[PDB]
Write a protein that binds this DNA or RNA. Structure first.
Ligand SMILES: Nc1ncnc2c1ncn2[C@@H]1O[C@H](CSCC[C@H](N)C(=O)O)[C@@H](O)[C@H]1O
Length: 246
DNA sequence: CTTAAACTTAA
DNA sequence: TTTAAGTTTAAG
């Protein structure tokens, strides 16, 4: 399996084989919650539409795509032993938050992802990244993963927008895979948004556009995805397949 | 995960 | 004429 170059939630390498098992074939894959892009990186659609509400993420992806060698050379300079200390980390974090240059921000974003606590991406309400130092022994520089991402990205378009807007880009030749923020385990991304996502999926499948949604397997998700074909993986993971008729 | 700060609420 | 209690946010 191909690895994402970012530490990120939703890395589903165990679930990847299961996702692909239920992901229909098509010309184009639409991912409204692309995240680290594990599915994009491990499928073979002719083209991709990849979206996320995180603007730093989407900016980074197009920079890696379009300015690959330049980016790798710049980012690699930050993965040295001298940068692995709290004082340096918090200054790079400040530089990131004060920068208005997309390229420099994208370079620092990778450093912060690998040197910060548990690959978290957390902002305050003013849009400032505020994840603390991770105190790792030796962070890994994902050079190979970066180049593989860039190569695959030649057939992808990236959009910073919410799920409703990106799902509207789907057409008859599209397949849609949704990996929303997880629903609550026991009985931000709101419950209303969770239900709304399902409503959009129902609209798409009526237009003969297949939609696959992954989430926790709870009574609430089963109610949301009640019009889909439900598959349980291995709290368990739920795969909701909206499969068009004939 | 935790504590602290910011901010609102109620009587 | 006030402030303990709640709720949300910040950040190590
Ligand atoms: N309203 C929205 N529209 C599109 N993307 C969104 C969104 N809200 C959050 N996201 C993105 O969705 C991605 C989820 S990755 C999360 C995967 C997994 N279900 C988990 O919860 O851990 C994140 O990258 C986040 O930036």
């Amino acid at each position: 399996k191909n690895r994402a170059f970012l530490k990120w939630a939703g890395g589903k390498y165990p679930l990847l084989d299961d996702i692909k098992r239920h992901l229909p074939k098509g010309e184009c894959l639409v991912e409204p919650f692309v995240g680290a892009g594990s599915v994009f990186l491990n499928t073979d659609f002719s083209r991709y539409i990849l979206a996320d509400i995180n603007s730093d993420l989407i900016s980074l992806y197009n920079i890696v795509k379009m300015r690959t060698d330049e980016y790798v050379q710049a980012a690699r300079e930050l993965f040295v032993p001298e940068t692995n200390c709290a004082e340096v980390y918090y200054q790079f974090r400040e530089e990131f938050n004060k920068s208005q240059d997309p390229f420099r921000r994208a370079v620092l974003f990778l450093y912060l992802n690998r040197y910060g606590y548990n690959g978290l991406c957390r902002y305050n309400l003013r849009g400032e990244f505020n994840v603390p130092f991770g105190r790792y022994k030796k962070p890994y520089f994902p050079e190979a993963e970066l180049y593989h991402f860039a190569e695959k990205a030649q057939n992808a378009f990236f959009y910073c927008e919410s799920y409703a807007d990106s799902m509207a880009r789907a057409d008859d030749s599209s397949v849609v895979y949704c990996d929303p923020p997880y629903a609550p385990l026991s009985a931000s991304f709101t419950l209303e948004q969770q239900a709304h996502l399902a409503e959009i999926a129902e609209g798409l499948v009526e237009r003969h556009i297949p939609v696959l949604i992954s989430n926790h397997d709870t009574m609430l998700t089963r109610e949301w995805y009640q019009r889909a074909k439900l598959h349980v993986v291995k709290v368990d993971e739920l795969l909701a397949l909206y499969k068009p008729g004939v």
